[PDB]
Design a protein around this ligand. Structure first.
Ligand SMILES: [Cl-]
Ligand SMILES: [Cl-]
Ligand SMILES: [Cl-]
Ligand SMILES: [Cl-]
Ligand SMILES: [Cl-]
Ligand SMILES: [Cl-]
Lengths: 295, 303, 299, 299, 296, 305
């Protein structure tokens, strides 16, 4: 169990024993879906030291998700950044994944309840493919607030992922309400064609930090980056395709809907970009030193 | 105080436990990812002094159907869950009350796509708008759009589904209205943030088709009573401006019962008060839930 | 010119000379399109009298159109039903067409002006069907129900109708048919649409189309004759393969459609259900129907 | 009252007295919505003179709007420019707002009227900014681009604006922001919409929104400051999390938005890029810019 | 091979030998998709609803403004003669109308409108136990892009794509949603669901106006079953009492699972069984009532 | 009749007599619409030679269309490039039109037949530019269709497939029935997509605008003109375009293999600009003719002789 572990969790202003990070079943977010979270990675750098990747941007995105929902968080940004470093340090972790989550408490359990506590907890733990286009449609931008990385949004991801894996695929790819490629269930989507890098415009899809990272490295590598509406059959005829996300970083996609992408192998743009990414997270990059925060 | 900090009994994973011991870890799958399902059920103090749950079979069927939509294997069958609900009312010494069964995904693995998590079940209950029911309420059309039927499984009564309802209800209430009315992605009226919507025009009863909206038990109840009153019930696509010109309008829901709407977007609905068909359906609904109907005695389970 | 006539117009409470029914170019409705109107007919009835068809319902729809716009009309329904009759009476008209219109006046220009006078004016003037018309499906799409309030009969909504109708008549067709934003048949540029197939009467559901009073009249008549009426989404190619089709409107009445997009509808002339409904309609407007006498108001 | 004033209106070829600018209530545009207008300003300049801002571009847009609707305007561009200056000059106006309007007359009052006169009239009259306004996202949806011709500045277009604007003001906000049919931000009820993020300027692509002359002025100024301008689909929650946001229009000039849907924008006052572009805009309209002197016409 | 067989095909007004029914590769329909066809069955008790199929055929040509140089009666007799001359009994008839080889522009007019009719002899436990269906990730036709009442060669690419998607992952058939996300139909069948004793089907909207559908609707009504045409969500299927497909090929086929969710008890439902039996009793001439649906 | 002619057609690996290139009526693609084709030109060039224009990209696109449909084409790309060339040479042609087509054969005729032969054929024939010459010089009259262009998750719009053309036939017939030269289709959202066989361009204030590659086809002639435009220093913008943007544009034109670069002088009875071929259109048309006629060192690899 992830519940049954030795360690420390930061909760509501202090470190507590991991197993004591409990709440009641009548917690608003459990019933109604309004809570926000992040996924942040720490890496063991070439130093031998450990640093968190883009800590500032992730924490700002967390507080912005809360802002979208008018959730007043009782901690400033600096407290939350320091808390995340503390969780890595006091758990004696090196390469790990951090999960900050902000949720609405147990005072009142109507839909419309106001006056519930806004809770915050932070835990951490140590830390090409075949893809199938999902029969489930990606979020509508005036139904769901797709810039807020919110607990309720993942039902659609779960459904899509479960569909893909039940039939033996590695991951799902979702189309938007107009039938264009939007994203994977937990990742942003990219395609390579004629030496140029394409990605769905920032419309229905999440505003990813790994996406932002890859986009910037591509421009610095002199690769043209185009944001546009992409049809499923552009993917089938692309030269390369890949996913980006905090968990997996850059994953090449060798097949969609049983149509081989390019030669079926990892492509040279995908490799150059994957390498440039490795250099930046292992702290072998002078240019992007400010993306790594040592614990 | 707080809903967590109470004396009584909650049924959880097969047994009654003390209320305060119904606890989950913060790394619980549903808390992070939104896939969980719940019901809201009412128990009423009936005309004969007793207590009875209203449409327990149908709510418990719907709960299990919601889990089925999500391929959540519930480790308890329907009969067990009906009996557990009656136990929670009994052992908390409740009369008129609200029941809240909830099924969620546990703490074993915390990826999006983790499989082999425990499917947990809990049932809590607690005791249970006089002006609104009599005079009607003021409703505002929301700027947020109701769920798309191939994005969200709108027949499944799911935790994640409610973000949209909170946002719409917060907008209405911030500007001083009683409730929100949401339109679907094509601009037709769908439903309230926790209620189904009806309108009356020239002695006929209209409701949005069972398209983007929840398949509501109170809705089903009111439609059956309407038909038993010889009232034509028509499922159709309804524009916001049909509402503005309707003879009457109202909401239905387990919490909401039958709540008349006297105003939408600052346009008065008919005479500005409870309408005569709304009152008739409201009144027949109250007879059925207070155990004063012989026809619908089978909708009440003594508890 | 419609402006240069003898006779009387009812304006803001009283009968005035026709030519004196004038407003300033800085009238809010002229600039910004928020005004509402109606079309109502009077007929010569079998007994030689003259009577307005469904006066109550037309006036209700007019005050409802205002209500939708939150336009506070300074006259009640009894007053506007009385005034309409007065306009027919004083202009010595028999068979004619009435045009009440309610608009926002001249005190303040600017989109968001509050405090303008809400004016009312009623004018009236003297006023295919056996054969069938040729129709063209428009390349312009009909109103979205959350952009325009389609239950309000509003000045601004008719830009769309003008574009469609001009597109049709420029290429030699009689009228346009408009599809909705989903590609399904909605209505003509100023009339509701019906189709007949295997003895049943179909018509687009009351979604984006106008709630026509002629539409309602003909639905009622159809039901009373034992014809099944079905309101559904209709594709253009159900029209091509239908047995009959027609339009309804106050000015139209029931007009048969013999061709859509150069595909012949049925045998290419007026069909038998259309004929029966037309005949039923004329019995009601000419005062031959005891059942429906309260649809006619004498004077 | 805007009808009851001293001054002169240019109408159908000549200056006439202001109160003589009258039309009949049976005027086609009043009933059916197809007429077009333009909003133009004259500003007092730094040399003490007075000039109209982008007269040539506003007049072209007006004539384009009529073209889109196939309204044959009986005056050429040069005549209409001279006419607008004559209206400013002859009413002894300095800082003012000018409103050329073109509409369809009174000869026939059917929907589909051929051979109505195309009328033209021009009037003019004398004519928050600092750390912003509070905006509410409308429940009404913005125009569909194949139902309404959104490039044509059309009387009927404004009914949607009036509805959104009244909804926002009724609840105590300053203005509405409208989403398009797909849920993306389109524009204000009378202004275009811009957001700033990470030192770049974003605006909804010219899709469902108006082709603004202030919008154009501001985009040009931005690019001349070396600010990157990107047209893209913008979600409402992108605005909640943006560094800055503002509106543009002829009447609004550049108005900062400090709050949308009770979410503070940035720090909740006017932002640095908005202030820069606002200052640049005022430098150009007050004639302090040699570079953009050809945007001003001496009166 | 279907091209290499003993028999007769009726083509452009006369019976020719089967292997003689040939066209050139520069045939307009082959390149541009505008052709129309039918599927008709004959049963051992009779062609089933020959008049109605032949009328739908001529209506499809009409929608496309394809002038067919034969009347309905001629085409009805020809179909009868094609079954006869191949000495067929239980069989499938395929009339096809297409556009010939005169001009290969998109916009070419003055191409010949050809007609050919073939037939050939004609899933028990699928009919008995029910099938496993997968909701497609391809969307069903838009009704102002494709003329969905016309049974048109080009309309079948969407069907093929979907069917292949479903079969590749081991399902029996695909189910397609429309552009709005509602249940439309299978790749060659109409869709029905039963709930609380009542029969539901997507409204005639994006779906094909099926002859088997119509048959089944009429039997249901005669049996006193309420039939409702409405928009249906995919999750309404998952929680339905019963579901099935109708089609000239599919007859009445139960659906026992959709997207790995069991429908009701996982077998053929009682209202499905009753409808399927009414259907087979009609096609095998065991019902006086509907005698005028069979030709002999 | 295109069936009744002297010449050679390449079919399933061989040159045979034109008239022998026959199939049965029971051919899957005739019934079900799954087949794919190209249109490709050859021109007589500056030195008396003749060359096929962008053969590489037309043949890669053909095979990609098969890919999208999962049609296993039994020849690789080289053989098909050479086969197209063979067919121009043997029929002794110069300025001509080539039509390769890949279709599903006659073994099984169920919808989901998954065992047919994948057949391939190439035909070519001559092209007379004078008959379309005045449209090229003076521009054409276009009518917005009441039919909507393909939805990108119903039809695979990057596959140039036999079945997509029903929509094009319908729109074209509607335009030509009422006396217009061509149709313009709007997409499911009301924006300008393309003509029934051509990509659409607009010019305004010196800049070149075209519909984003969304529901419209990824035209080789579209790509050719965008490239030439960028090389001439013209800003190119791919955006959503309303129909009233065309009514007020300074110039407009269609591109396509058949249509080359064809100006549009009127849409929906609204004159485009001065009502004649505009200057930018003329420049880009001349650059296009320069490239196809072998008058450009910059794009010499687009011609195979
Ligand atoms: Cl993550
Ligand atoms: Cl509830
Ligand atoms: Cl009328
Ligand atoms: Cl303005
Ligand atoms: Cl079949
Ligand atoms: Cl071509």
């Amino acid at each position: 169990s992830m519940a049954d572990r030795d360690g420390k969790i930061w909760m509501d202003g202090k470190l507590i024993e991991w197993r004591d990070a409990k709440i009641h079943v009548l917690t608003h977010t459990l019933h109604y879906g309004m809570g926000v979270f992040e996924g942040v990675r720490a890496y063991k750098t070439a130093d031998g030291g450990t640093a968190i990747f883009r800590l500032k941007e992730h924490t700002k995105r967390l507080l912005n998700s809360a802002k979208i929902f008018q959730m007043d968080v009782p901690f400033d940004q600096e407290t939350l950044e320091a808390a995340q470093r503390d969780v890595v340090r006091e758990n004696k972790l090196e390469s790990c994944y951090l999960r900050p989550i902000i949720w609405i408490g147990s005072e009142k359990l109507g839909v419309s309840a106001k006056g519930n506590t806004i809770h915050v907890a932070i835990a951490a733990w140590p830390w090409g493919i075949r893809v199938k286009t999902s029969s489930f449609t990606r979020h509508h931008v005036n139904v769901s607030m797709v810039r807020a990385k919110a607990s309720g949004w993942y039902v659609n991801s779960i459904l899509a992922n479960q569909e893909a894996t039940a039939d033996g695929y590695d991951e799902a790819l979702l189309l938007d309400v107009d039938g264009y490629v939007s994203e994977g269930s937990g990742e942003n989507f990219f395609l390579v064609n004629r030496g140029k890098l394409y990605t769905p415009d920032l419309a229905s899809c999440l505003d990813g930090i790994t996406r932002d990272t890859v986009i910037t490295l591509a421009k610095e590598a002199g690769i043209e980056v185009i944001e546009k509406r992409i049809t499923r059959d552009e993917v089938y005829t692309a030269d390369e395709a890949f996913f980006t996300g905090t968990a997996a970083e850059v994953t090449p996609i060798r097949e969609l809907d049983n149509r081989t992408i390019g030669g079926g192998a990892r492509g040279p743009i995908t490799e150059k970009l994957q390498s440039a990414f490795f250099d930046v997270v292992n702290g072998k990059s002078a240019k992007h030193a400010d993306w790594l925060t040592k614990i």
